[PDB]
Symmetry: C4
Subunit: 389 residues, 4 copies
Amino acid sequence: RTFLNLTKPLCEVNSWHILSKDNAIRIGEDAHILVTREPYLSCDPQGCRMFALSQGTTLRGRHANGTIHDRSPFRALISWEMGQAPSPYNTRVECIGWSSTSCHDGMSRMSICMSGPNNNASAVVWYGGRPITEIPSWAGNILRTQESECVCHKGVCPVVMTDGPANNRAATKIIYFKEGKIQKIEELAGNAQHIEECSCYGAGGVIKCICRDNWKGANRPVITIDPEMMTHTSKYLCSKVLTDTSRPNDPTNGNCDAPITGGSPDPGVKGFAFLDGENSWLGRTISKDSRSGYEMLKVPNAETDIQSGPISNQVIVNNQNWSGYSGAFIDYWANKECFNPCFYVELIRGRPKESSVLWTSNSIVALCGSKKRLGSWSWHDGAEIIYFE
Amino acid sequence: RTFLNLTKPLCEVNSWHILSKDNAIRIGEDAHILVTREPYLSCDPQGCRMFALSQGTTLRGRHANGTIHDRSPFRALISWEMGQAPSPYNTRVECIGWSSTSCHDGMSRMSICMSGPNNNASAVVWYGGRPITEIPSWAGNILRTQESECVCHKGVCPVVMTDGPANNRAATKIIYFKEGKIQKIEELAGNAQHIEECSCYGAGGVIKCICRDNWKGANRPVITIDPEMMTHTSKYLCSKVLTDTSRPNDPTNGNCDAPITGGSPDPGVKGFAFLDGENSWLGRTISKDSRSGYEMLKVPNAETDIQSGPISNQVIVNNQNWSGYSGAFIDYWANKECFNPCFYVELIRGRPKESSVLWTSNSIVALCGSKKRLGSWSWHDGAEIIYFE
Amino acid sequence: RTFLNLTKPLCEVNSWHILSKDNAIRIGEDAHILVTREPYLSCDPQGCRMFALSQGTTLRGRHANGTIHDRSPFRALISWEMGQAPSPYNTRVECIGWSSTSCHDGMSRMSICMSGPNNNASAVVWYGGRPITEIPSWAGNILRTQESECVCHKGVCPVVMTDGPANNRAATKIIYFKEGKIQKIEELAGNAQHIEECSCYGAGGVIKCICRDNWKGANRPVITIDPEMMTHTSKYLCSKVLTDTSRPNDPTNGNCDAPITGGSPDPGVKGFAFLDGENSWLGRTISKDSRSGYEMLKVPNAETDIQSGPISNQVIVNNQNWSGYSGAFIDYWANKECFNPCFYVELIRGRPKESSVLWTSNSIVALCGSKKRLGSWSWHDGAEIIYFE
Amino acid sequence: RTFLNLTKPLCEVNSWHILSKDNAIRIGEDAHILVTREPYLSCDPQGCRMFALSQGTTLRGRHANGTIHDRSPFRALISWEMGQAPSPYNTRVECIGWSSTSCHDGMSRMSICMSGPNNNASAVVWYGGRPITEIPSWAGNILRTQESECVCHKGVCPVVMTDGPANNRAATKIIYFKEGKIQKIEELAGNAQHIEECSCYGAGGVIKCICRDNWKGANRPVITIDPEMMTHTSKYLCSKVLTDTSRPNDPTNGNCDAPITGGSPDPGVKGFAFLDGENSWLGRTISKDSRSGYEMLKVPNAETDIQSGPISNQVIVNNQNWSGYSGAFIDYWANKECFNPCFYVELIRGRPKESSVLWTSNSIVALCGSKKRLGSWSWHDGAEIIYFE
Ligand SMILES: *[C@@H]1O[C@H](CO)[C@@H](O[C@@H]2O[C@H](CO)[C@@H](O[C@@H]3O[C@H](CO)[C@@H](O)[C@H](O)[C@@H]3O)[C@H](O)[C@H]2NC(C)=O)[C@H](O)[C@H]1NC(C)=O
Ligand SMILES: *[C@@H]1O[C@H](CO)[C@@H](O[C@@H]2O[C@H](CO)[C@@H](O)[C@H](O)[C@H]2NC(C)=O)[C@H](O)[C@H]1NC(C)=O
Ligand SMILES: CC(=O)N[C@H]1[C@H]([C@H](O)[C@H](O)CO)O[C@@](O)(C(=O)O)C[C@@H]1O
Ligand SMILES: CC(=O)N[C@H]1[C@H]([C@H](O)[C@H](O)CO)O[C@@](O)(C(=O)O)C[C@@H]1O
Ligand SMILES: CC(=O)N[C@H]1[C@H]([C@H](O)[C@H](O)CO)O[C@@](O)(C(=O)O)C[C@@H]1O
Ligand SMILES: CC(=O)N[C@H]1[C@H]([C@H](O)[C@H](O)CO)O[C@@](O)(C(=O)O)C[C@@H]1O
Ligand SMILES: CC(=O)N[C@H]1[C@H]([C@H](O)[C@H](O)CO)O[C@@](O)(C(=O)O)C[C@@H]1O
Ligand SMILES: CC(=O)N[C@H]1[C@H]([C@H](O)[C@H](O)CO)O[C@@](O)(C(=O)O)C[C@@H]1O
Ligand SMILES: CC(=O)N[C@H]1[C@H]([C@H](O)[C@H](O)CO)O[C@@](O)(C(=O)O)C[C@@H]1O
Ligand SMILES: CC(=O)N[C@H]1[C@H]([C@H](O)[C@H](O)CO)O[C@@](O)(C(=O)O)C[C@@H]1O
Ligand SMILES: *[C@@H]1O[C@H](CO)[C@@H](O)[C@H](O)[C@H]1NC(C)=O
Ligand SMILES: *[C@@H]1O[C@H](CO)[C@@H](O)[C@H](O)[C@H]1NC(C)=O
Ligand SMILES: *[C@@H]1O[C@H](CO)[C@@H](O)[C@H](O)[C@H]1NC(C)=O
Ligand SMILES: *[C@@H]1O[C@H](CO)[C@@H](O)[C@H](O)[C@H]1NC(C)=O
Ligand SMILES: [Ca+2]
Ligand SMILES: [Ca+2]
Ligand SMILES: [Ca+2]
Ligand SMILES: [Ca+2]
């Protein structure tokens, strides 16, 4: 019917309610479920779908062996009806490659996938299921993007992409698309020193992207995008509550304008946050060292006050269970007068933390905000690894 | 499309014709069929569909082991095309949780699931495939609901929920919904002493819910709802013909206002009845001790006459086979001048009655009223347990 | 969309071309294929589907064992997109039971199934996917029907049914439906002495049904129905070319008005022919004793001349391979000025002919006429029974 | 919705971007994937689909054994959503047989399959999912066609067919269709000496077909068709860059009007090229002897200059991996002012090159033109033959 406008404010959030869970690993023990990683969700005027990067093999298949590997010619972005597990019989192939993003502009879905060798990858940008535009690498070092949904306003959909070293300064750009065609390209500007795997959402005409600094900061960079002017600024989350993985203990003060460093042994993980003054929530793994457990912390003024701490918390996945990437999404077409925050968490099973199996895959759980105070429990993966031995 | 208005009477019923049967256990022995329980059926303007709570594993998979357990973070309400068996490939996830209800108001389907730990469950109410409202536990003891369809009139859909002990006085409420939003909440009133798992149907502007008293009565409670004023009354089925399971022999007289006690060893099962004067039918298991066999009895005036007995009978499942839950639905959108009574019977296989397997699951059979005098036979499950050993 | 009128003549047929083949057994050896029997095809404004009675188990499943049995509470009529093999994932349940018919009247599809014990069966008649009418057994002996498509004219669809012994005089009726409601019922009239499994088609306002006399005749009965007046007559195929299975050698003369006896060891099989003066074709098995091979014979005047012999032939399945039931259907909605005859052949595999396995099932092949002189080859099933040992 | 016409010019092409890949052998090691060969892709106003000839058994099934054999009554043309692997659950049967072509005219799709014994084969021509025409073998020796998409202009769709010897002079015709009806038949004319398996595309009101001369030449025949006059001419690709398989080294000059002999040990393979002045590209396998590797060569004026050589190259499948047939297609309904070239490569696994398994099958990769300078990597099949032993 119409191009989506981001005019609505964000809903008040006081707790999180379950939206969907696919139990993909429990089911994939017997049924023919695709191996995946890097999942997310995205909505359109008719409902929500799950997305992820297949590895082009089933979980029980002998080719599941060696699926710790991030990049091959056999991966592809695939989408399916929210709640089902991803099989070869229920999935649509959005595009071919090993890094992706996707979003619907109110009229049609744009989907983007990078593929190719490390020194020569390229993106193919699709719209309405047809390929529209190709983008070659500009720094010859693994051209990559969000791994969760992008956001559109009046037909303009910004996408953050990076090309360059994972462990040093790199070349990030924001590309503004309309119907899959490049409208403008900007070089990253501001105080964020390294940008990866941006988790983005919109409200009141503004798009905010909470990302992964894989170089220095255990605090997460924040890009603020104006989709009408097609301009942006960048900096860090102000809060002393650090939310990247492999982080040190939370300091006495955060820093709005420079990375807070430290932690061991990993340099980062995709994550997210909703930032709306008092109404601010940050997610993070529970363990400061590894991708284990997951908590949501309500931290008033996190985007602007270096002394902000948590006033409430919700365990999403207990610390005895494995988590992974986490990213934001919103059902912008809800029949509501405010945009209601949602998020998912990738439940990674297999290697390298579970090395008694030869594969690496995941399942999905997703939740959405509530104004009420709802009880909670842990929504871990649920599969028994001994069954796959 | 318009709102369903309950303007028509019940059709006359003199026997029952076969509507559907999914043979899920038979087919699940090889093809990839999800483990379920608490199934049911519900219709809309286009047709009827089957529903149940998945356990988030297939029947031959290793995770089927332990599915006797009722509540987990891996259960969800799923629905599918009537007659098909539920596989991971042909089921839509309606909501996540371990107790549910659903119904179509003539415009869209409302679905409701409860999830969470015992002392802190919440319901999420969906409308048109999107989440609308959340309701937290009010008594801190397994908030739960019907396990069969709800019924709407002019957009108003009442739901019965209980929170509190299973073996003592609890806190039942009736919640009136419209487009997923709460219109009114009433506390349970009248002579019913305990309320669970109501099976409801509509005719002539009036909604009747036949329930499970898990505390005292082997006679079933009956709530009568007026969807327009949003008020109700409650009492017991008067008839001496007892229909709950683990019940004593039928006494000389029933009791309209108080429970008839006795029976061993189990406190109750979900069941149903159609109450319409002379045109009244009661379902029950054939065995008075176990969930085995299933019979329909025409007992005129069962609703109001403590002396009422059966005038005809129809065996639905012979007493050499396992039954389970049973509930009501109607195709309110049929091209008829009256509303024709339908019902389903859950056919439970595995534990605890068949402990040579490690799982528990169910198939479905469903039948509807006929004014003719149709022959009958047993519609048992039909799987051979030894093939699963 | 309007009601189909049989306003057109039969196309001239000089040859038969391949329309569809599902190869269900070859595929069912590994993938999850439902056991069936008694298949057929039926078309509507949009296309053609295949139909069959499922046994409620896959072919490699342990419940395939014992599927020689014709009647059980686990059978159902299922329909699927023409060409595919029937799996639990791509099949629609039309109705429940162990004998059926189905046809489209231009607006919606009517499907009918009979179920129940031998001395008490009943038919349920469906229209647009809803139950409309119920019909109790009238002779207390396996109420049963065509096992191929019925035909409609101005919204009236006649159906031929039989109740009574298989080896003696039985009671056959013609029931005329309109949107699944009974318009009129007639007892069988004329000189056919027993009727079973009618294969019917329409042309120039007249319905012809070629049937199976299971009692005495190796020649097949023919019923001619006028769908506007709702009347019929009956007799036998006049040709000396006998086409039932288990027949004696063709005699010097046929018999229009009485059965011709003889044949070992089978009392009959479902069959068909198209009867149109010089343009007339008779199907039959190649073997006179058994369900083996299949051939099409152009026998001018077979309907009126006891001396009529073949002038052209086409082998459809060679005599080293198993056949089964056969029946007529036509795509009444084709973009052609005449109605072109089509037919299928059921290819039975397993018991009793192939007793090294425990099951009985089938695949399908279908063909339609051509005015050209096309070459041909055998379309046998194609599976290797050793693979299932 | 209208008849497509071919007035637009070909897009400029400087490199090739990934369009789709199905990973069928990888996924079919465990999931239930049909065995195929002779694939291609074809598009319509809604998108693009993959096509291939099934062998009517899955890859892991016992009936896979023996699938090197080309012709059987079990083969059929199947199509499915682009990117998925072909299983029994998501594939549409287009027509029955062992050699095919198909294409959409902007209103509906035409599909053609040949079937039958070597000496008496026949083609059935389908339009909009309905059979329209049959055509008998004229030379009595494996009537056969393109094995990739045909092309349409203003309702007229030409198709190239051959009947006659594989290793000598044969009888090739062009038949012109409109809604499945024959508008004209022509004998092959011009200097091409033998024609098989033409790969065709349209531009500037003209259709060019790049074929396989199986008789003498390692250079490829080129048939130029005018779909308005319904007439054609023929000769050979002029370039010294030879593109058929089993070919000698490239000579110093090609030959426009006669075959260039040599190569061992195979007489040819299906291949393609796009011919547009300086904007011309030729595909071929990397190995001169065998179906291994695959490369794209930009060769300015290949269609007219015998001295023309490559100015740029892109490896599509490396020379350590198996390839196979290759063909052209275009998405004629893209939103662009030019027709952008696309192509596929068939990735043959199993026999005869990999004789440790009993089967032959394939997977698919397809790419399209880019005006940009995109990097590349190999798109080989991906499966480990040792997992099938
Ligand atoms: C039922 O579930 C609800 C929702 O999870 C629980 O409410 C949570 O309760 C904990 C502990 O009472 C609260 O932690 C308070 O947290 C702040 C910030 O972390 C901390 O500074 C305080 O010392 C205190 O621990 C948490 O805020 C609250 N989360 C909510 C309401 O979202 C409730 O406890 C559960 N009820 C039962 C009976 O288990
Ligand atoms: C055929 O089925 C019908 C329907 O169930 C049977 O009719 C019932 O008859 C029994 C025995 O007289 C009564 O107790 C029931 O009240 C009747 N029930 C209904 C629903 O009508 C009939 O008995 C069966 N006939 C045979 C020969 O078995
Ligand atoms: C294209 C690509 O390789 N993406 C990968 C990125 C980057 O490798 C790192 O963020 C370092 O840049 O993150 C992962 O490796 C990771 O941390 O689990 C997974 C993901 O597949
Ligand atoms: C899922 C899991 O077991 N997490 C455990 C982790 C991991 O074992 C290590 O991080 C792996 O190196 O160790 C902890 O000390 C932690 O980090 O909180 C306890 C936690 O329960
Ligand atoms: C929410 C929940 O656990 N519901 C369960 C109820 C309750 O146990 C009783 O109604 C007592 O409240 O009945 C069952 O357990 C049962 O008897 O088979 C099944 C069902 O899953
Ligand atoms: C399915 C089945 O076998 N049911 C039988 C049951 C069960 O064996 C017990 O309930 C097990 O506890 O026992 C009966 O006496 C009964 O309950 O009526 C007879 C009935 O045939
Ligand atoms: C309802 C029913 O059982 N129909 C069956 C009929 C009857 O046996 C005969 O027509 C005698 O009435 O034919 C079969 O048995 C047969 O010959 O293979 C198959 C079919 O299932
Ligand atoms: C499929 C097959 O082998 N059919 C053969 C049959 C069967 O073997 C017998 O009917 C077994 O009862 O026997 C024939 O004489 C016949 O009936 O025509 C020859 C035919 O080739
Ligand atoms: C109908 C048919 O058999 N087509 C086959 C053709 C012809 O055999 C040859 O082109 C010689 O005519 O090509 C193949 O054999 C081949 O070379 O791989 C495969 C294909 O199945
Ligand atoms: C996939 C593969 O292994 N290809 C190899 C082939 C084949 O082994 C032979 O053609 C088998 O006949 O041999 C080569 O010399 C060639 O043809 O270029 C090297 C190439 O790497
Ligand atoms: C797994 O892959 C490794 C390396 O590719 C190989 O050595 C090993 O044999 C494979 N293991 C299995 C169980 O397939
Ligand atoms: C079944 O589950 C129990 C408890 O988790 C476990 O001890 C046992 O090993 C499992 N048995 C099988 C056969 O998987
Ligand atoms: C070709 O199609 C275009 C677009 O619909 C149309 O404008 C044009 O008239 C057509 N050309 C011819 C020659 O039919
Ligand atoms: C494969 O087919 C051949 C020839 O039909 C046969 O000899 C052999 O037994 C079959 N092999 C297998 C493993 O089935
Ligand atoms: Ca970091
Ligand atoms: Ca009770
Ligand atoms: Ca007979
Ligand atoms: Ca050649």
